[PDB]
């Protein structure tokens, strides 16, 4: 089940939802919450919809008629003529799925490196070798927020995270950090949240 992206929404409308069918080799490529481009063919699949009102029906053109005692009427008549409702729902038969905005042009560090393109890996290596990368990343993430250098640093370290561990006894030592901003009204708390979300 996929739904309309936020950008495409008209005014005062719920995001339209439809189901896409992934056949062989595309069967576990789309995951919940991801933004994905599906390429395929819009199709119609028959559905037994609980429409209270009669609509379109399909019946044979053969001009049969029931004899006395077997009058082709009522349920018997419908079953004899083969009357069947024609109700359809639009479904998408996606022959392929790709990420809408791929992270790499091409899950360990080596695998990510290979997935990266030559230019992308060169840029990543340059940033890694760049001293002052801390302040650079802070400014890039929050260029439009003045001050709050400590808050920006904390949010950056949150985005990076620590190393979760599991003790010999099985206790799962938390590895990711949580950050809470408490402050006076109109102090960019919601803005920090929106920056991180975007």
């Amino acid at each position: 089940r996929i739904q309309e992206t936020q950008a495409e929404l008209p005014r005062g409308s719920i995001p339209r939802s439809l189901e896409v069918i992934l056949r062989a080799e595309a069967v576990e490529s789309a995951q919940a919450g991801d933004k994905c481009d599906f390429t395929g063919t819009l199709i119609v699949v028959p559905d037994v919809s609980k429409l209270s009102t009669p609509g379109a029906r399909a019946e044979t053109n053969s001009r049969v008629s029931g004899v006395d005692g077997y009058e082709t009427e009522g349920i018997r008549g419908l079953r004899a003529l083969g009357v069947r409702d024609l109700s359809y729902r639009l479904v998408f038969l996606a022959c392929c799925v790709a990420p809408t905005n791929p992270r790499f042009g091409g899950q360990t560090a080596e695998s990510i490196k290979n997935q990266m393109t030559v230019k992308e890996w060169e840029k990543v290596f340059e940033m890694s070798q760049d001293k002052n990368l801390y302040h650079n990343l802070c400014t890039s993430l929050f260029p439009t927020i003045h001050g709050n250098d400590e808050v920006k640093r904390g949010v950056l370290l949150m985005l990076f995270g620590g190393v979760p561990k599991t003790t010999g006894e099985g206790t799962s030592l938390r590895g990711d950090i949580n950050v809470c901003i408490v402050g006076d009204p109109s102090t960019a708390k919601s803005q920090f949240l929106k920056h991180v979300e975007e």
């Binding site: 009669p54 008549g77 003529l81």
Partner: protein, 238 residues
């Protein structure tokens, strides 16, 4: 167990020769004038006063109260048969149903063949050509009942009750006589409705289709069909 032809003649006599001084001491033949207006199609509902009926024939009022639906139909048929002899000018075709009625009557006259005996299923249902309704104004003698006291002994009886309206639905179209048109013969089938529901017809019974032994499927039409404003309310005990 009574002769309904005689009862019909009695109700016809009442409707045709009843009079009162409702207008400043002027004998005006109340129900005659109402019949005139009904024929002219300037009036839809006709309210027969059982007080007026009892003014001459109390036992007829008793029979009506004991079996109202039957006598409602008898009065309706009497008015139907009486309208032509009170008609004085041409109806202005108030609505689409009037257009349909005039078309059907015209083509029936066209294909009349007066002497030929027609199958009973080969005529227009009476309710399909009414354009009027007949109701009873309960007699003053009948004391109003109580919703709790109106029980099986009153089934089919003309009871008068009083109460508070706790609810009423909105006027809906309830089908009285379904109409169907065939894809082979160009003849109209009709299905009067008495049950709360119905099963739409599949095959056409027209003489032409039966002769040709064609498939003769027919389609339900909201155009030629007849509807009536329908409301469902709930009255409550005082």
């Amino acid at each position: 167990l009574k002769d309904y032809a005689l009862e019909k003649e009695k109700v016809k006599k009442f409707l045709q020769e009843f009079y009162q001084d409702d207008e400043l001491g002027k004998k005006q033949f109340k129900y005659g004038n109402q019949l005139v207006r009904l024929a002219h199609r300037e009036q839809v509902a006709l309210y027969v006063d059982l007080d007026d009926v009892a003014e001459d024939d109390p036992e007829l009022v008793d029979s009506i109260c004991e079996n109202a639906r039957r006598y409602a139909k008898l009065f309706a048929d009497a008015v139907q048969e009486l309208l032509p002899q009170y008609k004085e000018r041409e109806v202005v075709n108030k609505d689409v149903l009037d257009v349909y009625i005039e078309h059907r009557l015209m083509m029936e006259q066209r294909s009349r063949d007066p002497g030929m005996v027609r199958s009973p299923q080969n005529q227009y249902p009476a309710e399909l050509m009414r354009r009027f309704e007949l109701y009873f104004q309960g007699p003053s003698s009948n004391k109003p009942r109580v919703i709790r006291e109106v029980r099986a002994d009153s089934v089919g009886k003309l009871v008068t009750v009083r109460g508070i309206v706790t609810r009423v639905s909105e006027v809906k179209p309830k089908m009285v006589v379904a109409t169907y048109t065939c894809d082979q013969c160009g003849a109209e089938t009709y299905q009067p409705i008495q049950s709360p529901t119905f099963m739409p017809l599949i095959m056409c019974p027209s003489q032409e289709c039966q002769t040709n032994r064609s498939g003769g499927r027919l389609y339900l039409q909201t155009r030629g069909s007849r509807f009536i404003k329908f409301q469902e309310m709930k009255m409550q005990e005082h």
